Design a protein around this ligand. Structure first.
Ligand SMILES: [Mg+2]
Ligand SMILES: [Mg+2]
Ligand SMILES: [Mg+2]
Ligand SMILES: [Mg+2]
Ligand SMILES: [Mg+2]
Ligand SMILES: [Mg+2]
Ligand SMILES: [Mg+2]
Ligand SMILES: [Mg+2]
Ligand SMILES: [Mg+2]
Ligand SMILES: [Mg+2]
Ligand SMILES: [Mg+2]
Ligand SMILES: [Mg+2]
Ligand SMILES: [Mg+2]
Ligand SMILES: [Mg+2]
Ligand SMILES: [Mg+2]
Ligand SMILES: [Mg+2]
Ligand SMILES: [Mg+2]
Ligand SMILES: [Mg+2]
Ligand SMILES: [Mg+2]
Ligand SMILES: [Mg+2]
Ligand SMILES: [Mg+2]
Ligand SMILES: [Mg+2]
Ligand SMILES: [Mg+2]
Ligand SMILES: [Mg+2]
Ligand SMILES: [Mg+2]
Ligand SMILES: [Mg+2]
Ligand SMILES: [Mg+2]
Ligand SMILES: [Mg+2]
Ligand SMILES: [Mg+2]
Ligand SMILES: [Mg+2]
Ligand SMILES: [Mg+2]
Ligand SMILES: [Mg+2]
Ligand SMILES: [Mg+2]
Ligand SMILES: [Mg+2]
Ligand SMILES: [Mg+2]
Ligand SMILES: [Mg+2]
Ligand SMILES: [Mg+2]
Ligand SMILES: [Mg+2]
Ligand SMILES: [Mg+2]
Ligand SMILES: [Mg+2]
Ligand SMILES: [Mg+2]
Ligand SMILES: [Mg+2]
Ligand SMILES: [Mg+2]
Ligand SMILES: [Mg+2]
Ligand SMILES: [Mg+2]
Ligand SMILES: [Mg+2]
Ligand SMILES: [Mg+2]
Ligand SMILES: [Mg+2]
Ligand SMILES: [Mg+2]
Ligand SMILES: [Mg+2]
Ligand SMILES: [Mg+2]
Ligand SMILES: [Mg+2]
Ligand SMILES: [Mg+2]
Ligand SMILES: [Mg+2]
Ligand SMILES: [Mg+2]
Ligand SMILES: [Mg+2]
Ligand SMILES: [Mg+2]
Ligand SMILES: [Mg+2]
Ligand SMILES: [Mg+2]
Ligand SMILES: [Mg+2]
Ligand SMILES: [Mg+2]
Ligand SMILES: [Mg+2]
Ligand SMILES: [Mg+2]
Ligand SMILES: [Mg+2]
Ligand SMILES: [Mg+2]
Ligand SMILES: [Mg+2]
Ligand SMILES: [Mg+2]
Ligand SMILES: [Mg+2]
Ligand SMILES: [Mg+2]
Ligand SMILES: [Mg+2]
Lengths: 99, 104, 83
RNA sequence: UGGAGAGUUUGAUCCUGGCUCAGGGUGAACGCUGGCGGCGUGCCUAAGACAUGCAAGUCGUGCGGGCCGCGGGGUUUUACUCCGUGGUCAGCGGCGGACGGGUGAGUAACGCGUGGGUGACCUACCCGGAAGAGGGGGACAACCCGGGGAAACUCGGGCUAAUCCCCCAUGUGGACCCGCCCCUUGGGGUGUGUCCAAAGGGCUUUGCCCGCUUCCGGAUGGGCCCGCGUCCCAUCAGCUAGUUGGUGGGGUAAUGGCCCACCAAGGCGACGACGGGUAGCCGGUCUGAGAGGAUGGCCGGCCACAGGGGCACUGAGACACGGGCCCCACUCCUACGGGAGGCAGCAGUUAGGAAUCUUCCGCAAUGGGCGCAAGCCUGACGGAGCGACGCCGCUUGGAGGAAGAAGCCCUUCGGGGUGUAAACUCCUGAACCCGGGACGAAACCCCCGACGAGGGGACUGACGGUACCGGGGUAAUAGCGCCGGCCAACUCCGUGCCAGCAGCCGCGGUAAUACGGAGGGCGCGAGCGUUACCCGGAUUCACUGGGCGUAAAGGGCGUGUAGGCGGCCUGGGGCGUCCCAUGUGAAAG
């Protein structure tokens, strides 16, 4: 018995926790921006959105998001933030949205 | 090429969707005689532009839902419930053929 | 990646390879993408090796990696000769 | 270039009509028999259970160590300590483990086939092109220290390297939001804003190789969708509420009720829904004059499954046969707390069965994985083994030899048959002996040359001392079925409706060509029969190619719904139909 495929398993768990972690952050900061924007705080909302954008791309840097999975998140994020700010806002900090 | 089919709109009781009854003819694989077989397609209609009796062309499309993989291309000719009628009667005729009685 | 290798087609003790272009992952005798030659190791007939340099070169130019024996044969037929 | 019919209903006849035979086929099995060889082929049953060995690894040219050596330094000497090198062990890291191999359980389905769609997508390694790799920081194993456990193993504490993780920079470029333009379902371009790169290693060292990063593309592989086709039962007729559609969202590489919230009330069915039965589909295979019928072993393609059920993680890719988690059945270890397992991989065991093989040889060849390479690993595979299981080739002799031996045999007792058969004469010479003895292998590699083209060289055979060649050399296996008609082949004797034959007709109740034996004969021959099953004959479901007064078959009659069918003339269209071109129609067969 004993096959050193056990190694791939060990390795997968380290990878699992790593991916799992990055994502948690993404969702947390995303919801964060979607919140401040919803409260019309353009300045610090875009601020955070930028961090979320950054984390998303970096996640797709390796094999956590990759492909167009990253692109959706970003899209969905810039969309909600920009719309929610359509409630008296004016992109103050002019983060990642392009006037 | 995206298949293009032509049929009649039998159902309208649907939001942004119409049922197109499409017929086809072909020789019987063994008995020769030309036989008519039909099929209903649920086609996409974003503007609810077509009604019962409208003969429309339908085109193969990117899925809009389960069942809906066709969109209404254009109108070929309208108003003609003679076609809708066959379908309706043939539908109502289903009352007689069963186990329970029915004034079909 | 896609390869240019030999597929076994003779009979017992009567090997007759078929130089084919296939994906690396297929059975050696499974579905190939294209036949571009043949090879009779025992040289039972004067015609124990045909290749079609034209084609061998098209695949090489798009990725196809030949096995060692594959290129040995392709070369013997002047696939790489540039003189 | 392709088509044969026969027996059997009556005293006899014609017809109807069923049954039966002659032919061909099979992953066969059974009986009697059995010599050689090539090539194929061999669990069709319990997808019952499986002992044992083997079936996936590989990289020291990504990294740091442990154990065991050998050697060299610092030193006046010891302790101590620095470096180099060999072996070995796992670890971290990477590529592979998503292929290759197995089985058809499930599935009547976009599963498969065929033709198309993707402006709804992905694709590691390979190829082409563009641009690039500046700086800083961090952790976890190994190892060291300690703890709980019978074990499996598990917990904590400390140290450390990297092509391991992270930050800042450069931004060719690319991603996203908004706008504009071209396209037109999410395609391409452009502008502002934001966001995102990198890994180092090796020397035949101060360049070149292996590799890293972002992007455009190629190639290959793949996801998803659509038209059409794909068995039986209507003694299954109604089915459905995630159901049908919409909006928004979630999710994915991507469309979609895929999933969720909310709204609408739909959707499907006799052109057979739903339900039940059965079944992996195909290229093909068998049969048939064809149309068609039957089928799907082997080989090739697709799908599905890996003890049963569910699930997700890691990945370019898996919901992953020899990876992970949980539930269930079971086997196993147990210090009873708790653990370890899953041959539908090769071989083998056991069970079931009428029935299906070697616990073999090799990685020499082809193919695959990893490595710069050497090379390692490959029960893929190449071979050998067992079985008349199939196909083909071949042998058990060749020529002469009585108007005809012996025996057996029938006999109108005179003869007739076996029989040129034998004996015997001569000739060859399967077996077996001796000798030689392969092709399959030339690449990788190394040298020259540019690590290129090209040239040169060396290593390498499991099969195998086998094939084949040459010399020597013995006459040296035969069987099985049948002989009433169909159906080629008849006599004696025994038996006496008995014993028994028998495919269908039918034989046997004392002269039986039909039972049993014998002689003889016919047929085929390393086989011959038998049983089973498929197609044929069977125009015996009839499309080609049938019928219904009395043979089986007209509805008891009508009314009429769907459906089927539709007079004469002209015109438009051009769906059916026909024509031309073209694409597709994998390989095998
Ligand atoms: Mg949170
Ligand atoms: Mg008859
Ligand atoms: Mg009678
Ligand atoms: Mg009679
Ligand atoms: Mg025997
Ligand atoms: Mg054999
Ligand atoms: Mg089986
Ligand atoms: Mg075992
Ligand atoms: Mg092995
Ligand atoms: Mg020393
Ligand atoms: Mg090691
Ligand atoms: Mg497979
Ligand atoms: Mg069913
Ligand atoms: Mg599908
Ligand atoms: Mg496409
Ligand atoms: Mg492609
Ligand atoms: Mg490239
Ligand atoms: Mg560091
Ligand atoms: Mg240490
Ligand atoms: Mg311990
Ligand atoms: Mg620690
Ligand atoms: Mg440190
Ligand atoms: Mg940065
Ligand atoms: Mg730029
Ligand atoms: Mg557009
Ligand atoms: Mg644009
Ligand atoms: Mg732009
Ligand atoms: Mg360097
Ligand atoms: Mg209803
Ligand atoms: Mg929706
Ligand atoms: Mg989406
Ligand atoms: Mg509702
Ligand atoms: Mg059904
Ligand atoms: Mg089945
Ligand atoms: Mg045929
Ligand atoms: Mg016929
Ligand atoms: Mg046929
Ligand atoms: Mg067929
Ligand atoms: Mg089989
Ligand atoms: Mg097959
Ligand atoms: Mg698949
Ligand atoms: Mg089992
Ligand atoms: Mg993933
Ligand atoms: Mg296994
Ligand atoms: Mg038995
Ligand atoms: Mg090999
Ligand atoms: Mg090899
Ligand atoms: Mg003679
Ligand atoms: Mg070698
Ligand atoms: Mg040189
Ligand atoms: Mg050379
Ligand atoms: Mg003799
Ligand atoms: Mg007889
Ligand atoms: Mg006769
Ligand atoms: Mg008796
Ligand atoms: Mg008698
Ligand atoms: Mg008598
Ligand atoms: Mg007799
Ligand atoms: Mg027939
Ligand atoms: Mg009749
Ligand atoms: Mg009658
Ligand atoms: Mg009448
Ligand atoms: Mg009646
Ligand atoms: Mg007419
Ligand atoms: Mg009509
Ligand atoms: Mg007309
Ligand atoms: Mg037409
Ligand atoms: Mg055509
Ligand atoms: Mg063609
Ligand atoms: Mg073909």
């Amino acid at each position: 018995r004993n096959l050193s495929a056990l190694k791939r398993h060990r390795q997968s768990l380290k990878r699992r926790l790593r991916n799992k972690a990055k994502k948690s952050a993404i969702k947390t900061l995303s919801k964060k921006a979607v919140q401040l924007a919803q409260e019309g705080k353009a300045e610090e909302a875009l601020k955070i959105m930028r961090k979320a954008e950054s984390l998303i791309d970096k996640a797709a840097k390796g094999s956590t998001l990759h492909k167009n999975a990253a692109a959706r998140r970003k899209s969905r994020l810039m969309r909600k933030v920009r719309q929610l700010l359509e409630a008296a806002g004016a992109p103050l900090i002019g983060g990642g949205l392009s006037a | 090429p995206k298949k293009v089919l032509t049929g009649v709109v039998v159902s309208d009781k649907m939001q942004k969707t119409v049922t197109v009854l499409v017929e086809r003819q072909f020789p019987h694989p063994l008995y020769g005689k030309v036989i008519k077989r039909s099929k209903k397609y649920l086609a996409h209609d974003p503007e609810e532009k077509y009604k019962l009796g409208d003969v429309v062309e339908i085109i193969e499309s990117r899925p809009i839902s389960k069942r809906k993989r066709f969109r209404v291309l254009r109108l070929v000719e309208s108003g003609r419930m003679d076609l809708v009628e066959k379908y309706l009667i043939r539908r109502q005729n289903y009352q007689s053929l069963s186990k329970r009685g029915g004034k079909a | 990646m896609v390869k240019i290798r030999l597929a076994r087609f003779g009979s017992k003790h009567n090997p007759h390879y078929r130089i084919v272009v296939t994906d690396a992952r297929r059975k050696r005798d499974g579905k190939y993408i294209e036949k571009i030659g043949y090879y009779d190791p025992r040289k039972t007939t004067p015609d124990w090796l045909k290749v079609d340099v034209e084609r061998a070169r098209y695949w090489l130019s798009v990725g196809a990696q030949p096995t060692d024996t594959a290129r040995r044969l392709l070369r013997q037929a002047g696939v790489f000769r540039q003189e």
